[PDB]
Paper text:
Here we report the high-resolution (1.95 Å) substrate-bound outward-open structure and a functional and biophysical characterisation of SiaT. The structure is in complex with the sialic acid N-acetylneuraminic acid (Neu5Ac) and two Na+ ions. The sialic acid binding site is near the centre of the protein, lined by residues from four helices (Tm1-Tm3 and Tm6). The electron density in this site corresponds to Neu5Ac in its β-anomeric form as seen in the Haemophilus influenzae periplasmic binding protein (SiaP) of the sialic acid TRAP system. Tm1 and Tm6 adopt a distorted helical structure within the membrane bilayer at the point of contact with the substrate, which has implications for how binding drives the alternating-access mechanism. The negatively charged carboxylate group of Neu5Ac forms hydrogen bonds to the hydroxyl and amine groups of Ser60 and Thr63 and a salt bridge with the guanidinium of Arg135 (Tm3). One Na+ binds to the conserved Na2 site, whereas the second Na+ binds a new position that we term Na3. Na3 is 6.5 Å from Na2, towards the cytoplasm, and ~14 Å from the substrate binding site.
SiaT comprises 13 transmembrane helices (Tm0 and Tm1-Tm12) with the N- and C-termini facing the periplasmic and cytoplasmic spaces, respectively. Homologues of SiaT are found in a wide range of pathogenic bacteria including Streptococcus pneumoniae, S. enterica, Staphylococcus aureus and C. difficile.
Residue numbers in the entry: 5 to 399, 404 to 488
The structure:
Amino acid sequence: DFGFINYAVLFGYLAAMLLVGVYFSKRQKTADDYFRGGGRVPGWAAGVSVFATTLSSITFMSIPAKAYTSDWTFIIGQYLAIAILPLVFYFYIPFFRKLKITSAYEYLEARFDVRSRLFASLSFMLFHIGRVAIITYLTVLALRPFMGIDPVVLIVLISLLCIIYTWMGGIEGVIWTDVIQGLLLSGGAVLIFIMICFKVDGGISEIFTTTAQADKFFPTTQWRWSWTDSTIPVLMIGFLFANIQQFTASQDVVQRYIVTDSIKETKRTLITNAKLVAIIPIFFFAIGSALFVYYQQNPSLLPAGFNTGGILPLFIVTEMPIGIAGLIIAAIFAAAQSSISSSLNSISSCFNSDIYTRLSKSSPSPEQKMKVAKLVIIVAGIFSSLAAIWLVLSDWDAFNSLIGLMGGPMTGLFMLGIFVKRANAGSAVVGIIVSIIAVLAARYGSDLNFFFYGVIGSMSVVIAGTITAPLFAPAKQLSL
Ligand SMILES: CCCCCCCCCCCCO[C@@H]1O[C@H](CO)[C@@H](O[C@H]2O[C@H](CO)[C@@H](O)[C@H](O)[C@H]2O)[C@H](O)[C@H]1O
Ligand SMILES: CC(=O)N[C@H]1[C@H]([C@H](O)[C@H](O)CO)O[C@](O)(C(=O)O)C[C@@H]1O
Ligand code: NA
Ligand code: NA
């Protein structure tokens, strides 16, 4: 078994997350508290929270498996995510801040009209219900063979517990848990790397040389155009657009831009996040390369037909010492939970502003907004968790892959509003329609690589919403 000591580390970590939630529950009086944090978050904390929100068990498990089986080409993705940040700061964040947004999609009603706002908000909320279910599913897939408990108990520990502290704690409790979880997964990744270096005969130098000799850093055979394969050009355009989605059009990140009290602290949020993205992800790639060298030096330690997605967890549970092993498991929990908590709170912030407030005939009182803010964390939590239970016990993708395609059009709407002065409500709507059709064509009637779905979706809104602008009444002004 995992053992009592390893467990006690895990349950200490879980108890610490709940206690942070209890601490921040006292200050939740209004929706402003619960979603905007009353302007009490410093920049550095919001920036760690952005990193921990975006980096989930998807990165933690997949990126090492990917470097193990192939190469580091995907890391170009991380650096493109940093490269766009000044553009976000200069062109997007001033609108978000000056409008005193609760939900990012309020910008779309201000720039265009309610149809664009609601299309984007519903696509966000549905996508993130999926992201939570997926994050929870992968974590369970990773840990289940090695914990000695039923999948459902594991879901209680990963998901239910996360729901409780998120519910009590508001965006402040979500952010301060994220800071701990962000730093825990970061040190955890560094510590895994170190340990694998100490177990490879020849250490870090042999890990480097073997990897470079196998052409597993940046193979030039991947510098080629393709419509179907995930080559360097495809993933560069693909990650550029995914990153623009993540940092301009996605409520879980955009929410962190408005919790700081000044633009000075807002810059600190982006700067802190940039430092983490420039340093930490490299360790996840380095881990897959290290493990590859380690299991080439120790061929009999893998069962034949072992799934390469389980090699990292296999190494943790079989090769890391007692206490340390329990802490790495807590760090995988921390990668999952920091993303789950942010997605639940953002889902509730969108529901509160874009659905409940915007569509009520009269404006809800402060006390009413607070109630619904809390309630939607439970409801979304329940739905996300059931889905995760279904994914586990059965062996669905349709809904998820379908709603995922709406990320492109949501992101195009922001690019169009922000950069095309003549675009207007109607031309944005023609843009959505064109975008939707184009993405369904890409996904279901072609063999195009998945990296193209976002670019197509985005650029379809931009192009159709630009060329059809003169057919509708002149654009709303919106002067900041
Ligand atoms: C998915 C692919 C589809 C893309 C095909 C291109 C679609 C382009 C549509 C262009 C026509 C838009 O239709 C829009 O209709 C309203 C009524 O419908 C027009 O009407 C508006 O202006 C006119 C000016 O005379 C007024 O008489 C009218 O009362 C007012 O509402 C808008 O000026 C026009 O902008
Ligand atoms: C460029 C890239 O790989 N982006 C990935 C990011 C980054 O790894 C992370 O934000 C650190 O920069 O993590 C995810 O959002 C995640 O783990 O759920 C998946 C996404 O595909
Ligand atoms: Na996370
Ligand atoms: Na979070």
